[PDB]
Design a protein around this ligand. Structure first.
Ligand SMILES: *[C@@H]1O[C@H](CO)[C@@H](O[C@@H]2O[C@H](CO)[C@@H](O[C@@H]3O[C@H](CO[C@H]4O[C@H](CO)[C@@H](O)[C@H](O)[C@@H]4O)[C@@H](O)[C@H](O[C@H]4O[C@H](CO)[C@@H](O)[C@H](O)[C@@H]4O)[C@@H]3O)[C@H](O)[C@H]2NC(C)=O)[C@H](O[C@H]2O[C@@H](C)[C@@H](O)[C@@H](O)[C@@H]2O)[C@H]1NC(C)=O
Ligand SMILES: *[C@@H]1O[C@H](CO)[C@@H](O[C@@H]2O[C@H](CO)[C@@H](O[C@@H]3O[C@H](CO[C@H]4O[C@H](CO)[C@@H](O)[C@H](O)[C@@H]4O)[C@@H](O)[C@H](O[C@H]4O[C@H](CO)[C@@H](O)[C@H](O)[C@@H]4O)[C@@H]3O)[C@H](O)[C@H]2NC(C)=O)[C@H](O[C@H]2O[C@@H](C)[C@@H](O)[C@@H](O)[C@@H]2O)[C@H]1NC(C)=O
Ligand SMILES: *[C@@H]1O[C@H](CO)[C@@H](O[C@@H]2O[C@H](CO)[C@@H](O[C@@H]3O[C@H](CO[C@H]4O[C@H](CO)[C@@H](O)[C@H](O)[C@@H]4O)[C@@H](O)[C@H](O[C@H]4O[C@H](CO)[C@@H](O)[C@H](O)[C@@H]4O)[C@@H]3O)[C@H](O)[C@H]2NC(C)=O)[C@H](O[C@H]2O[C@@H](C)[C@@H](O)[C@@H](O)[C@@H]2O)[C@H]1NC(C)=O
Ligand SMILES: *[C@@H]1O[C@H](CO)[C@@H](O)[C@H](O)[C@H]1NC(C)=O
Ligand SMILES: *[C@@H]1O[C@H](CO)[C@@H](O)[C@H](O)[C@H]1NC(C)=O
Ligand SMILES: *[C@@H]1O[C@H](CO)[C@@H](O)[C@H](O)[C@H]1NC(C)=O
Ligand SMILES: *[C@@H]1O[C@H](CO)[C@@H](O)[C@H](O)[C@H]1NC(C)=O
Ligand SMILES: *[C@@H]1O[C@H](CO)[C@@H](O)[C@H](O)[C@H]1NC(C)=O
Ligand SMILES: *[C@@H]1O[C@H](CO)[C@@H](O)[C@H](O)[C@H]1NC(C)=O
Ligand SMILES: *[C@@H]1O[C@H](CO)[C@@H](O)[C@H](O)[C@H]1NC(C)=O
Ligand SMILES: *[C@@H]1O[C@H](CO)[C@@H](O)[C@H](O)[C@H]1NC(C)=O
Ligand SMILES: *[C@@H]1O[C@H](CO)[C@@H](O)[C@H](O)[C@H]1NC(C)=O
Ligand SMILES: *[C@@H]1O[C@H](CO)[C@@H](O)[C@H](O)[C@H]1NC(C)=O
Ligand SMILES: *[C@@H]1O[C@H](CO)[C@@H](O)[C@H](O)[C@H]1NC(C)=O
Ligand SMILES: *[C@@H]1O[C@H](CO)[C@@H](O)[C@H](O)[C@H]1NC(C)=O
Lengths: 171, 326, 326, 171, 326, 171
């Protein structure tokens, strides 16, 4: 992948996380579970939905072929009509098929980037209070309960609060 | 104690293509192209189509004696013409500007048949013997078009200058037809219209017409070596038609007040059945019931239809690359 | 001691749309589409358009007596025809191949009127009484086209075979007109052209023409139940025209040396005023003065104009997402 | 954002920085100020200008509708001309509107990436001689005067020069 | 001990353009557009083209006496017509529906010449003196079209009603020609066809034709002030043609069984040489031997050719930005 | 560049690495050499090849102009045919030229990202057992022989194996 996360340094997806495109898996004394990052998932849903709707809107005109007939002495204008209708058919077939291939590539990259950025967002908060395993997982140098976990997920993790404990366990 | 960042996976086997890679399995996607159709014709805006059955367009508006089922007023959302329809022009000859006529008729939604020139119109001639074995009805071996009158001489007298006039005082254009007869030899010519130079001349504020019989023996068609030149025109609202002839006139009898549709016009040549159904999109090869953006069924349709393309599939990825574990 | 990395913000409220998001405010952007016009006609390459005023194209080049303001030489960058112009074909009848004539005239930039056949040309006939109450001038109740001559008999003699020839020895093609008269009855026919079969025959190295009068009473138009069939043609450089008739000839009198434009041709049907202005792009609905790439004003224009699209706005982001603090 | 900088880990823009798209805000004993990164800004200006000019150049042909008339017996070729002209109108309207939406998305991403890369470029020079606050700001572990600041901005920051002092203050 | 991450560089100076930057040197790229041609004509599917040489299309299928090299059966992958070909219509006049004829002929791949009406067909008239100094052969000063017969009277008798019939019992359509002669004066008319009204009438199951001579003196072309109206038609399989005339008939003599190509048809007007070569793509300006996707040579071609565009170059980057050190 | 690697923090390319688009240059006691990363190079080759083939496939229809003639009284349908043929010519010329410019930009970005991701992939394995010079080069804090080097290149570098030695030399 272009951003290296999906099928990258995070080798696979989670069938266990069913409520979102992007999220977390935590482990502590209270056990383990999956949680979707609601913000990044919803933002992506809105964007992709906007993209699909935009494509649909731009494709919402139709070239219309006619049932008009042409006599034996109208081969030229008859062939003119055929080449015209076939012409626009080829143009729109091209436009649709090329757009789909292009947007599919970019859509997948978008998801890849969102995962990458979500990872970065956690790495930034945790700093050296956790150990980066290189697979998108962080091992805390301190005890991180359910509310500590949730603070990481909602971007309000308190690094100074666990700094001294982490340092001691790290060193 | 651990926290991991990750992404959705599911049991999807649905794939998409990209510029970089073919066959990519994604968690979520949407198909934009419709390839399914109901192989039938339905109503459009709850308006039924007109089935021409065993009659062609020509047979219908000329009033071919075997097309009485269609005879009179008609309203339609579109026209269905059957490919092997047998009842068209029964008495051999060419209907001039046929393609333009079909295009004009296609652009309409309703015709109202009325008597434009009663047989009383043509003075000094016979309006009772205009029939032929080439144009039989379902009960009679020799008949003629319900909208035309084949005029011949009284038993022994000469063919006089006959005249007719019609003033379109209505608000709608009038589609009408007439003809010129071309006998195979001068014998038949004399027997029917007498001797001397014959003419058919017709005119409006915007149209001039003038034709003379062209006598010659042509190959037998429906047992006839003679021919009729059929013509059509449209009398605009406020215009007046004058008919003048001294022979060989197939006179206009009944005509049509013509209602042009504001929408798009269609004439489908098909064997598909017209059923008791509604639709918003009617393709020549069937009904599309879909909300999809594209379709590969046919470029020929009426109503609100998806864009026609040659593609087999146009699937947009919406979700991400599906990589389920294990 | 600190250093921070950051990006520009400003007071912009101008927004753009993307595939992912509508209404994104950006610091800098450019509008590519022009939607403003000057509702008027101007000169193109400092060349003025030709205002036909109260005359239609037909009235102009036929030489309708009420079109003397236009009569003679004209140069134009394009043609403006007013929608309710009254002075066209005054004596009722059809100008044949009218649409092709308009297309031909549109492809030109200059005509030079000259006398192609002086009335001296037609021997043994009257060239002085060809007038009609259907074609009045501004001072006279009965006149005729300045470019045609309605020829009739001398008071009592018969109509002889008249002949005319013109050899285009110039370098420019010649646009010329002629006609055939169709009386309502044989009485008027005899009164004007005498008795016997009448013909109008004209020919060049590449054109043949042959027509005979078609006598019939048609609905009254401008107090006339008779008609004239008007015709036009183009005498190529080096070609020669021969005119031969024994009656019913509306003869060519004046014609036009025709200068075809190398550029694009335009004929605008509009009520907009022609003012004393210059322009590089002239739309049928007004002047565009812009450097923008697109426009949604009209697909019909002459000169160097932006591409026409249906879009309301085509704004490209150039700057970044505007996120001003606070 | 795709690259996570603009409206991302750098929450907002600077109305105070008026001379460039991308830049710096420094604070030291001599005070504080905004400075545009001239290199990255100019590079972006040249690229975006090239994009706009390229789009304009490709759009620099016109389909031309004609004022030609058609008689009552020319409904077919008359309708042929109408469908043709409307056909190209729809094609070009599509091309223009779709291109704009696509390029607007990519243009904004380009700016986002340039900001991200500018941030990375500073992070790379400073290393552990500074503290990354996670908002695009770095707090030096040493005194960084105007010429030290400028060396960071022009890519010639001397990490060994301040290494020992930084380490002492950091530890 | 070190490890570094890096990317490929080479000695490429080949550049591409992007939306963001012009002239970017890349390590690898591919040109999609072909601009090279072999300035010649070759065979298509090992089928040779038909060189019309000094004869135009008209001269060829009319059977101009100087086109005997082409006379008879022909098979072709396409037609080459030389721009300054001199042998077309030798006896002045118009070949009607010429453009449709060229389009029809272009849609074919083979004609088989046969005798459709032997001179024995026309009874009571002379089929031996139909020649003219306007139509010389290479050995004779006065000849005529190999496919037509100019019929005149026996030395003193009148011109009788002549008749001919042909029943197309084959499986292929038949392309045939005929004409009507128009003398410059009644003297020549009487001298050749006698007195009285003359007609030419022809008919099939789907075609009617009727023409009378139109006598007039037209400008001299190839020493002739008279003209011939040439006509053409296609006798469908199973159709029958009836010819009937009492004068002024240029009768059909030889005709062509016509084989319509399933593929695309082409007629190239060019001076390029036909050589002994094969090709898959034949442009009007030369042969393209390429596997490229686009070409800027010409939009006119036959066979499997690349898409035509106006571009000078369409080079896709495949490798990366080339930044060689030092 | 958008991803900042090519002509970025890695200033130039390697003419010495001839067997791949993306790779490594190592230095140890056994000397120095270039080695292409086979996986990332082949993946890129397959993608770019797919892109070129896809573009070719979508462009594999032709509008066909005809040699049909029109008389002096057929100026309208004659001009109709000309405007139609020129119309599709302009459409396809636009489509081809615009696509090439767009795809060239994205192709170059793809290569840039692949280099960036390859760099990240090495940085992730090495951690603090090596020193990042900021130019894509890593100086090991331990002796890394040919098999150690190859383990980095094939993603199986053993960080714990060299952890203690690296720490000692680093500290
Ligand atoms: C991100 O997610 C975290 C959760 O993981 C959240 O932070 C917590 O917010 C809750 C708010 O409900 C805090 O709960 C309060 O608890 C105190 C007393 O709790 C004591 O024990 C905890 C145990 O760790 C200690 O850490 C604390 O220091 C406390 O001494 C309680 O008084 C308080 O207010 C009322 O609670 C009763 C129930 O409603 C009520 O009846 C009573 O009258 C009290 O007035 C809260 O219940 C919890 O302590 C926070 N976590 C930590 C570690 O401190 C973040 O939520 C923030 O959101 C904003 C809007 C603020 O309004 C607060 O809710 C949080 O700061 C969340 N962030 C975001 C952005 O969503
Ligand atoms: C990135 O930006 C930094 C500035 O922040 C710049 O580095 C500085 O470059 C200037 C060049 O003008 C250096 O100034 C020189 O100063 C010495 C004496 O200054 C002493 O005091 C400083 C105070 O910190 C000490 O650090 C030094 O060690 C010195 O002992 C002076 O002799 C010298 O040359 C002449 O100066 C007089 C004025 O022109 C002249 O009359 C006299 O005859 C001298 O010949 C300079 O004036 C400054 O010291 C640099 N900063 C540091 C920390 O050392 C970078 O500029 C580089 O650009 C290239 C082209 C070189 O030619 C030098 O200009 C710099 O190395 C700048 N980099 C880029 C890429 O733009
Ligand atoms: C990434 O690249 C590295 C190389 O840089 C590779 O790891 C090496 O794999 C080879 C496999 O051939 C290992 O070689 C074995 O060596 C032992 C004895 O060697 C001892 O000396 C080394 C020197 O450092 C010590 O480190 C070891 O601990 C050993 O004590 C040998 O017994 C073994 O098996 C046979 O070898 C003979 C030759 O075939 C055979 O005749 C005999 O009967 C033995 O059965 C291997 O030869 C080498 O030790 C590895 N490197 C290190 C540092 O340990 C990675 O290859 C892996 O690939 C998978 C498929 C496994 O099957 C192994 O090949 C490796 O784990 C490579 N990774 C990838 C993904 O490609
Ligand atoms: C798994 O099977 C199919 C998709 O392959 C579909 O029914 C659904 O996504 C899954 N089934 C259930 C019962 O959830
Ligand atoms: C991949 O494409 C091939 C076409 O060759 C076909 O087997 C199928 O569409 C795809 N394979 C799957 C879905 O397993
Ligand atoms: C047609 O009828 C109307 C009746 O309102 C009359 O005013 C008009 O003059 C008539 N036109 C002709 C040509 O008779
Ligand atoms: C559109 O049609 C699809 C059929 O696959 C259906 O799943 C979807 O719900 C429909 N959407 C709406 C808005 O009706
Ligand atoms: C702020 O207002 C508008 C833009 O909203 C414009 O005049 C300019 O960008 C600003 N005004 C001044 C005076 O700078
Ligand atoms: C956002 O779009 C809406 C259209 O519904 C309209 O209010 C306006 O264009 C935008 N809103 C702004 C600029 O506040
Ligand atoms: C026309 O005039 C030119 C005068 O140069 C003459 O050569 C030519 O023969 C004339 N053509 C006819 C048909 O009279
Ligand atoms: C183009 O027109 C715009 C009008 O908004 C103007 O601001 C700009 O300066 C013009 N550019 C040139 C090069 O004239
Ligand atoms: C270097 O020169 C050209 C390319 O500029 C080409 O022959 C090849 O890539 C190189 N030459 C050799 C001999 O490798
Ligand atoms: C860059 O483009 C210019 C066009 O102005 C031309 O010199 C050449 O194509 C390029 N320059 C090179 C390849 O050195
Ligand atoms: C034409 O010939 C066939 C011979 O099989 C015959 O059946 C048919 O009746 C003929 N048609 C005419 C019109 O003579
Ligand atoms: C296509 O043509 C090019 C000519 O530049 C050639 O290098 C290449 O090998 C050809 N490809 C095939 C598959 O023949």
């Amino acid at each position: 992948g272009i951003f290296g996360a999906i099928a990258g340094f995070i080798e696979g997806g989670w069938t266990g996380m069913i409520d979102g495109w992007y999220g977390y898996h935590h482990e502590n004394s209270q056990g383990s579970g999956y949680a979707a990052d609601r913000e990044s998932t919803q933002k992506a849903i809105d964007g992709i939905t906007n993209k699909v709707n935009s494509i649909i809107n731009k494709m919402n005109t139709q070239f219309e072929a006619v049932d008009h007939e042409f006599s034996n002495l109208e081969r030229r204008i008859g062939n003119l009509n055929k080449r015209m209708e076939d012409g626009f058919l080829d143009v729109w077939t091209y436009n649709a098929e090329l757009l789909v291939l292009l947007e599919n590539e970019r859509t997948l990259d978008l998801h890849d980037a969102n995962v990458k950025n979500l990872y970065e967002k956690v790495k930034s908060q945790l700093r050296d209070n956790a150990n980066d395993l290189g697979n998108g997982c962080f091992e805390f140098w301190h005890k991180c309960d359910n509310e500590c976990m949730e603070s990481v997920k909602n971007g309000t993790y308190d690094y100074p609060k666990y700094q001294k404990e982490s340092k001691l366990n790290r060193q | 104690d651990k926290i991991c960042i990750g992404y959705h996976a599911n049991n999807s086997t649905t794939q998409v293509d990209t510029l970089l890679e073919k066959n990519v399995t994604v968690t979520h996607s949407v198909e934009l192209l419709e390839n399914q159709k109901e192989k039938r014709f339905c109503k459009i805006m709850n308006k039924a189509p007109l089935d021409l059955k065993d009659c062609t367009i020509e047979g219908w508006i000329l009033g071919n004696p075997k097309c009485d089922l269609l005879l009179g007023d008609q309203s339609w959302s579109y026209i269905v013409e059957r490919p092997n329809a047998q009842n068209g022009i029964c008495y051999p000859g060419v209907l001039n500007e046929l393609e333009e006529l079909k295009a004009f008729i296609g652009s309409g939604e309703r015709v109202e048949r009325f008597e434009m020139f009663p047989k009383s119109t043509w003075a000094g001639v016979d309006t009772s013997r205009g029939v032929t074995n080439a144009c039989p009805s379902y009960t009679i071996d020799s008949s003629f078009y319900r909208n035309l009158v084949w005029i011949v001489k009284t038993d022994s007298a000469t063919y006089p200058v006959i005249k007719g006039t019609y003033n379109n005082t209505g608000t709608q254009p009038i589609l009408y037809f007439w003809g010129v007869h071309h006998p195979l030899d001068t014998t038949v010519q004399d027997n029917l219209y007498g001797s001397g130079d014959k003419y058919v001349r017709m005119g409006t504020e915007s149209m001039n017409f003038a034709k003379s019989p062209e006598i010659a023996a042509r190959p037998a068609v429906n047992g006839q070596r003679s021919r009729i030149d059929y013509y059509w025109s449209v009398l605009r609202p406020g215009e007046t038609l004058n008919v003048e002839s001294n022979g060989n006139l197939i006179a206009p009898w009944y005509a049509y007040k013509f209602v042009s549709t504001n929408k798009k016009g269609a004439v489908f040549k098909s064997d598909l059945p017209i059923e008791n159904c509604d639709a918003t999109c009617q393709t020549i090869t069937g009904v599309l019931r879909t909300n999809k953006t594209f379709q590969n069924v046919s470029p020929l349709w009426i109503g609100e239809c998806p864009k026609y393309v040659k593609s087999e599939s146009l699937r947009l990825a919406t979700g991400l690359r599906n990589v389920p574990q294990i």
